[PDB]
Symmetry: D2
Subunit: 117 residues, 4 copies
């Protein structure tokens, strides 16, 4: 809830993207992706509570957003299988991460908002 938040918006309907599956992975020493956390976006398009300060150590993380299932639910043919946002988490003050995604059937945009309390 504190260190890693995801927010997803729908650019076709001008709304939060609701009930979107989100999977978070951390890169392991053997360079495979290890499941870390997951959830579904809320009615406000948000997913909180994925991890804790103590669990969210420096490392390379992947946030996969299942955009294809979302567009299929709406009856709209999409391009992407999903979105895959990959980043290194870096200590340097008590940083929080918000991964924002804006979805269209044939385009997505993702931004990171990195702040301090």
């Amino acid at each position: 809830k504190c260190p890693l938040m995801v927010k997803v918006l729908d650019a076709v309907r001008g709304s939060p993207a609701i009930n979107v599956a989100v999977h978070v992975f951390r890169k392991a020493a053997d360079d495979t992706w290890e499941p870390f956390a997951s959830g579904k976006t809320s009615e406000s398009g948000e997913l909180h509570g994925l991890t804790t300060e103590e669990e969210f150590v420096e490392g390379i993380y992947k946030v996969e957003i299942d955009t294809k299932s979302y567009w299929k639910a709406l009856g709209i043919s999409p391009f992407h299988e999903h979105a895959e946002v990959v980043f290194t988490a870096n200590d340097s003050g008590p940083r929080r991460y918000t991964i924002a995604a804006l979805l269209s059937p044939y385009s997505y945009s993702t931004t990171a908002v990195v702040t301090n309390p």
Copy 2:
């Protein structure tokens, strides 16, 4: 053609946005918007030939893209009346400007690529 080019893409269909009206204005000495050029995008989503090197002097220009008529023709009631850029041109000498717009019913993005001849 070369000095000012517009490209418009549809993020719902993954296609050029074809036959989109584009109106260009230039700010006059009395701080009003004067008509400068207009046209429609081609089957490739592009609009060339709006102006010339001789005509495209220093100034503040506004490019208004009629996105609402575009979406309405496809059965969609969009949020915005139009997409735009407003920019100062040729401040440090002539440049070539490509204005790219990416359209969704409730979102748009406008990007400039500026090249030195």
Copy 3:
């Protein structure tokens, strides 16, 4: 605070865009733009309290975001003079409007999130 909110993000620094001037206009019967509301974004990149339910009637509105002054404050040369988000406000249930903008020096993206309480 309720019916019209603006949120601005900085894609270069991964942060809220703070102290950005925002001006809202409503189109008048003579097709000129009449000042309606204005403010600066907060430390969270947000601007609330622009209008009230009673004041925010159907009409055509323009939200201008002074992006050029923001980039100038950061010492970064920008393309746009500002962003100009123009839309019709439409009754049909108790709708709220959030105008979100994502800023880069040579590109901006704007989305509308339109919801009900």
Copy 4:
């Protein structure tokens, strides 16, 4: 060339993103990512010639754009390790795919333009 093209733009400088590494993978029968093609963007920010009509069969493809090396070379420490698309190709017969990426240090967007030959 014709079947799969990549274009990369820099939203900080308003320019093509030049000499950006691009790696393409194809999902194999055993659900692993197999190397398919790679290259670097030209002075126009474009990468052509990755594959052919004969080689580019139905499949799930991943295009990984090395945006982190790009930003680092310009003195910028960016948020993301790379930009990507993952997509199913040629499901309803051969198509021509242009993958466009627009880059900022803490944000990227990937758009597909899909044309029927």
